[PDB]
Amino acid sequence: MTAAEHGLHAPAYAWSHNGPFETFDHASIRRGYQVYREVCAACHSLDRVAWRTLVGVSHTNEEVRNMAEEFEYDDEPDEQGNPKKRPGKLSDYIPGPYPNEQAARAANQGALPPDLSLIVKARHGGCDYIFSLLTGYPDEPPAGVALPPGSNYNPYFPGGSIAMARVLFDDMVEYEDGTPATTSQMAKDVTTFLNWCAEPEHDERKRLGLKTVIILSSLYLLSIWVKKFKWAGIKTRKFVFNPPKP
Amino acid sequence: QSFTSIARIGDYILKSPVLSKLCVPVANQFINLAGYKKLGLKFDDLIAEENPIMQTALRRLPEDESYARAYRIIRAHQTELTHHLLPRNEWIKAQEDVPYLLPYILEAEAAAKEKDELDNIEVSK
Amino acid sequence: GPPSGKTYMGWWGHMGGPKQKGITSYAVSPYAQKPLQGIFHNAVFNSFRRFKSQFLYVLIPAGIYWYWWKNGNEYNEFLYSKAGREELERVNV
Amino acid sequence: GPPSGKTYMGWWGHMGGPKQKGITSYAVSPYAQKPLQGIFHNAVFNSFRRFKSQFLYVLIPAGIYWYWWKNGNEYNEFLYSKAGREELERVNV
Amino acid sequence: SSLYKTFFKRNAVFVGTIFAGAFVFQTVFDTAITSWYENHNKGKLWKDVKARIAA
Amino acid sequence: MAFRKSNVYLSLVNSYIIDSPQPSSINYWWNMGSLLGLCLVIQIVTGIFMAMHYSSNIELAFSSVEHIMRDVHNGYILRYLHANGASFFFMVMFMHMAKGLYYGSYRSPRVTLWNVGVIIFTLTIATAFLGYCCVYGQMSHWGATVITNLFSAIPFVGNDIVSWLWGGFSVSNPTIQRFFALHYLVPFIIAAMVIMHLMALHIHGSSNPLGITGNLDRIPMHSYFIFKDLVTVFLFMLILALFVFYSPNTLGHPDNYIPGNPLVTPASIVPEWYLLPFYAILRSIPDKLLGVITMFAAILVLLVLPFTDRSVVRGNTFKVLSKFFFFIFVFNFVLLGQIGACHVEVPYVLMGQIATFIYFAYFLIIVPVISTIENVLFYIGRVNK
Amino acid sequence: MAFRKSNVYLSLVNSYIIDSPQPSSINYWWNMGSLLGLCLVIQIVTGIFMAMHYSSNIELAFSSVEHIMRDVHNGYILRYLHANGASFFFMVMFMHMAKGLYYGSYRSPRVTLWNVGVIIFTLTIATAFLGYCCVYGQMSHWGATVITNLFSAIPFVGNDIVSWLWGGFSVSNPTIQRFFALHYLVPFIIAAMVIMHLMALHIHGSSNPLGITGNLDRIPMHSYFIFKDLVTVFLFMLILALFVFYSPNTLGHPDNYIPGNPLVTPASIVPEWYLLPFYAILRSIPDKLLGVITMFAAILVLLVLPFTDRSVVRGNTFKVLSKFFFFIFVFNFVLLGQIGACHVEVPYVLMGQIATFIYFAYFLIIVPVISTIENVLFYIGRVNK
């Protein structure tokens, strides 16, 4: 199959969370959330993430409460039956930009921006892919490529023709922690935040793993020793034959 | 495959000087690569015994050969479990690797084949 | 209970083997043996032996299959590159 | 197989009973017997016998329980009617 | 090893002493691991990020 | 006698696990069986606990698995254990099967033992597949579509059996719900089949690496093999642990983290790694009917081995030509798997076709021919007349 | 020997169903066992087919059962069969149990046989109850609430076990979904337990109405009892048919055709008819803890019978005092059931309390006293000195 069809192979960036003993970088998760809210949320939903899961991860209980209340959700009908709204609470799920699939396509040339809740696990390449796609838009497509109207070229995307334009540009976000918001810094951040969205158990899973692997390793070594001891009588056993007379 | 059949083919090759000089040297090389001799076994010790022909054969085998087969088999299992081979001076020599059970196996097969033949004989008037 | 069918294995005391005689076994308690540590110096050069006799039966068939795979793969890569788009139209349909 | 525990039942040929002698049984093939229709005239008045000996053991305990139930029920009905609202306040709490 | 013969004296360790030791192990081990783990990732955790924040 | 011998229930345990006479020389290849029982338990236990939080409705299936992943305490451990466990179940089964092939375990008097094992293998494939469909991801939907369509190949009624299996016009809500019900049922049939497997094993006992009788020197299952089994049980757990905690999705497909879509089939479909060799065989036949028949035959051909093995000795331990060809067969199987992961393109299609030929030829041509030749070689190398 | 004897699998069938030596005199009371196996099959089969269309979510459970009733072809037959089958399962079990009580089947050497049977009875009660909760009607919800709360009686941790069992603040979506998962599991445990029951029965064989040995005159299970079993199997089916087609809801409760409501408990709650005797016992003790302990004891007391029966002969066939009291016990049990269907009102509460006393006194006082007296009567009626 032609390279253009498979797509350019994403290289291996040194993510701080790569490695058996490494946790996510929560500061990066925090920043990433801002990039998602200020840039991505305009077209991408995050349906599977609940406000409460942000508490103690990237924001305080108070901060998340304020964020959730800026949005309205359908409340239970009043004493008379007429519908009524209500501010958001921690139990709710982060709302999306569109009310349905049809309106989502209408606002995007007919394309459907997928939900980003599992995006990192739903693509070969994971973080390396998402980052590479975001920072890999060339100013001009390679010579000879007949790019369809309304499309964009990106080498990392299969077939090269993607319906999402470049959306990250230097300093389009004012990082609350002071960090220089370069396009690569922002891509590096959202991706980390998107990895957490898909694998919230990450940090904990690796801690439990370290305990599990130490016990089982020890048990394995110990069993060998016990087995050899229990077998020593059979192993060193010796025979002698003395032909019986007729 | 019956031993009667193995013998037919093997004997035909063994008699003709054309094949006899071509094959035997290959067969001898095969037997050494098999390595059963390094475990103190004779080829006949390796024959699968779970069938009537082999049970009849082992039953007719004289006492002294039987006790010897027993010692060879036990000795083999013990060496195998230790993941070693016997010291070279204990290996079965080619002169020793004789088909001692074969004559009993062939006798039983003929007896068996005859019965099969007789139980099914047709009659022409 | 109901009568049982004849098998090729019995149980302790009537296993089904031939009558044994002349063979004498000897053994020493695992308790009186050297604690597991002597499986070196005496049992190290002896080891790995049971794979020097076998690796050929595994390596050759492996080698054969690895080269066959590598060959067909490199050919595929060529066929779908620019240089091979001509031969691709030949072997394809 | 492994040795089995002693029971109070064996199998055909060694059931576990005492040695029998002197007893002689006789039987006639079901094929040579009168087709099922003779279970009347000769086997009708004889029947129902195995319940004329038992019904008392069933009837008395039944009777006892039926009257006990009927009594308590009729009492309940009275207690919750108008006539018994007075006695109801007495036995209730 | 005479270190063994002082506590158990030529006998094996009994279930009770095994179960008791298991309960002790479970707590000690978990603290040792959580500690080493958090120290290895110092600067990346929420604890560390919360300090650099003031609201 | 001892209580373990006299009690009605304990004697069963005693005869199968404690006093069972084992051939003194069996090696670690004989440890796969117990490992298979362990796998069966791990699959049943983790499955029941997840069933407590799972919804089979087509509109909720995918999200209920996400619910197990995000909200259920220790939920991700349960799912990754169940999922990675299925893979480990097949890795161990292939080794169990290969061990049997190499040592002539399928030979008389263990034919019944071998045939019941083939049935178990089929039931396991069916079970894992049904479980795969319960996630209702992209791969799930198309797999449910392809496998059920496999039946349309039957002449006349075929398309009917299919609409029946679906319970409608296509893979929909009646499909996934019946698949869940079925995924829960089959594992208990495997358990019963595993008991029959063990009953058949008990009448003649285990074979050994020398291929000859074990009746002259046996040692009790209890102590020796109980403790030897423990060694591989722990090693098995260590490795499974590494995947579950450190690399939970390496043996899965990213497309399954995308909800099933009736209108779009993924641009690149790669089935479960343990089905790849069969997927390649299917793909290699440019005819619908013949394609499915040859695939099913790839499994049923295992039944032929007791008859085509013409040898007079059991096993490949002392057989030069058989050992060599045994490995050609093994690596040919791996190759078939590699072909299955590639696109239907030029060098691959022909390679797939030849590998398929080789696979069937091993059972029907190579084994009978080679075993006959080896029989003769063994004879003429010692007879002096 | 015959193939049915030599084959590893067929010999099991031969020894249990074909050549099994039966006492020539057993009567139709010995036909309940096979009827119990049949019931177990009918429950499992109809259950799996309905599981294909059932949704365990609390918002869909009730409607999915209605969906089975209205849309699934032959759906109502499946539900009415499953539902009415559970009742028939208990009618037959009580007769199986009563038969054992009357003939001293629980006596040595069949104690193990009797104890395994008690375990099965408990597992069956648990199974039917879980199934009852899956309908999620009004009775379902409150039953799930009451039975799970039964555990709060345990001191200290009791209320914890309960919130654990619920998986939340109250009987909710985590409850009903785990109950469905569990309802599917338990029947297969009963099956395994039924096999152990049969193994225990096989070592000493069936008893007979005379209470003495059967070793002097046995006849093969095959033909005689296979065909006699057929007689009651058909009679059993005829009667079940009458309820399923002509009166499907007579053994159910109208309140279960009303969706469960967390805020309202029905004004009149009457549990399943086969649980009524136990419901009455519970209600008769004005203390929470003692109430649940006495109810559980009503079942466990069955274990005591092999020790309190002081007689020297097995069974009540030749015993005047024992037959009489046996029936007092039977009708006392029915009475307890009738009390359970009434309101906690005046004549009933005291009647319930006395009946409960009588129930326990039968096992602990009446049987040992009466059997001793009968032993002596038997002696002094023949010894002349």
Ligand code: HEC
């Ligand atoms: C609307 C103007 C968008 C904004 C702002 C961002 N995205 Fe987007 N995205 C959009 C569309 C229309 C599509 C569909 C592309 C197609 O050809 O199907 C997408 C897609 C993605 C994807 C998935 C790509 C894939 O591999 O299939 C990713 C990973 C993605 N978008 C990420 C992303 C992020 C992180 C953004 C903020 C930095 C972002 N998008 C903004 C439309 C729009």
Ligand code: HEC
């Ligand atoms: C109800 C009990 C239950 C049993 C018994 C069970 N499973 Fe599952 N299985 C499930 C459920 C629920 C899921 C869906 C959750 C999930 O994806 O893991 C599942 C999913 C699966 C999957 C998909 C894994 C994935 O990628 O998510 C496979 C494969 C599987 N089962 C294999 C097996 C095998 C093989 C066995 C038994 C030998 C088995 N299961 C027994 C309940 C069960």
Ligand code: HEC
């Ligand atoms: C999944 C398989 C399955 C098995 C196995 C099964 N059931 Fe059920 N059962 C169900 C389902 C689904 C329902 C809900 C539908 C219904 O109400 O009938 C149910 C409901 C019930 C009910 C409620 C009946 C009613 O009024 O609607 C009872 C009682 C019951 N089962 C008893 C049993 C008993 C007793 C057994 C076995 C001995 C059993 N079940 C085995 C699936 C099963």
Ligand code: HEC
């Ligand atoms: C296609 C074949 C096949 C399959 C699949 C199979 N078995 Fe076996 N099994 C065998 C054979 C043949 C033997 C006899 C091995 C010998 O003695 O050489 C055996 C032996 C065993 C043993 C004895 C110890 C050993 O490993 O040799 C156990 C335990 C066992 N199997 C368990 C299982 C379980 C559990 C499963 C799967 C759920 C299974 N088997 C599936 C063929 C199979």
Ligand code: HEC
């Ligand atoms: C509490 C007791 C108890 C329960 C419940 C029980 N059994 Fe039994 N069972 C017995 C006893 C005791 C016998 C011995 C009868 C005799 O020979 O007198 C018996 C005998 C049998 C028999 C032999 C034929 C007969 O009816 O006497 C079968 C078959 C059987 N039981 C099946 C079952 C099945 C199936 C179940 C339920 C799923 C069951 N039993 C539940 C006590 C019980």
Ligand SMILES: COc1c(O)c(C)c(C/C=C(\C)CC/C=C(\C)CC/C=C(/C)CC/C=C(\C)CC/C=C(\C)CCC=C(C)C)c(O)c1OC
């Ligand atoms: C002749 O040679 C042999 C040999 O014979 C044997 C037996 C072994 C040893 C290995 C085995 C015996 C393997 C056997 C495995 C099995 C019998 C597995 C049976 C499988 C099952 C899945 C059992 C079913 C389990 C359940 C129904 C219960 C699980 C569910 C539970 C507990 C739910 C609990 C719920 C709540 C709410 C708490 C050898 O190693 C061997 O080598 C030489």
Ligand SMILES: COc1c(O)c(C)c(C/C=C(\C)CC/C=C(\C)CC/C=C(/C)CC/C=C(\C)CC/C=C(\C)CCC=C(C)C)c(O)c1OC
């Ligand atoms: C000594 O005295 C005896 C005596 O011993 C016996 C045995 C009997 C005869 C009675 C019996 C043997 C009863 C036995 C009953 C059982 C063994 C029942 C076992 C129960 C089960 C539930 C088996 C489990 C079934 C399944 C897993 C399969 C069902 C499901 C299916 C087929 C789903 C199919 C799906 C699709 C999509 C088509 C007597 O009458 C007797 O009297 C004197």
Ligand SMILES: CCCCCCCC1=C(O)C(=O)c2scnc2C1=O
């Ligand atoms: C023994 C049965 C082997 C199963 C072969 C079917 C393999 C198979 C396909 O052929 C296919 O087209 C798709 S699309 C999604 N999954 C699959 C899959 O598993």
